[PDB]
Design a protein around this ligand. Sequence first.
Ligand SMILES: O=c1ccn([C@@H]2O[C@H](COP(=O)(O)OP(=O)(O)O)[C@@H](O)[C@H]2O)c(=O)[nH]1
Length: 277
Amino acid sequence: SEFELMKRLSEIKVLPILESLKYIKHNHASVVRFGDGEIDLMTGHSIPYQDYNEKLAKRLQQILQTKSDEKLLVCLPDVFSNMDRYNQNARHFWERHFLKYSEFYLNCCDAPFYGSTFISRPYIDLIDKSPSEAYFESLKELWRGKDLLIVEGATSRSGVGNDLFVAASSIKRLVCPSKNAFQYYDEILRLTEKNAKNRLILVMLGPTAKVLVADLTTKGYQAIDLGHIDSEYEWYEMGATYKVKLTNKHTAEFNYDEGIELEFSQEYQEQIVARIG
Ligand SMILES: O=c1ccn([C@@H]2O[C@H](COP(=O)(O)OP(=O)(O)O)[C@@H](O)[C@H]2O)c(=O)[nH]1
């Protein structure tokens, strides 16, 4: 019954984090990741930071149907095999998720392989956190010495107050809405293009990020969907063992963005090229 579905879905093949990073670097590929929220949206549901939207839903479906080629790595949650890597609560969440969406997952994902959606989630739900340093060190090699364009939300503040991007040669940021960024999609795409000349683009923008990465990739740019990497890095730096709320910025899975004390970070402010919303 349900278990038969769990087993059928284990036919989906995901390159785990460290392995995914190698594909990206070899092809200098854009990366687009599909997580639980994207499945929610595609099957018709609103999620905490993005209301359901038909065109977004169609685009996401189209993007997931794109085979991982040389220009793009398409990622799925790395939960279809070796679930034992994750804590019990994560395992329960993910199995319930892919069974709720058995109709979707049984018909959506026939590509020979996928990257790991957890390249942005390399710490908090793991039982053995040892490879995390290797994970974060390997991630950092994507931007060491690069000029970056970071497209993210107002509360995202990726790298703010930590050393995640210390080795980037420069950072420019396009700061978009923290929720429902798709309401402003046309502008976000327009300014990302204008600001992306000779830069590696990193996108932390929920479901909108996926369409952005795809459209950018169509227009020739390399764009990497990095989602909640900052939350996971903050948790890691703290040596955290559970999802603790951050006080100064957005925190993964505290997605209402309530109770935040924003700070003035002059370095962050000097990186901002434009605000949208
Ligand atoms: O309309 C939105 C949707 C989300 N985000 C940001 O998108 C990031 C999370 O992206 P995603 O859902 O892809 O993360 P994942 O959990 O898959 O890593 C966070 O910084 C959110 O603040 C945003 O700024 N605007």
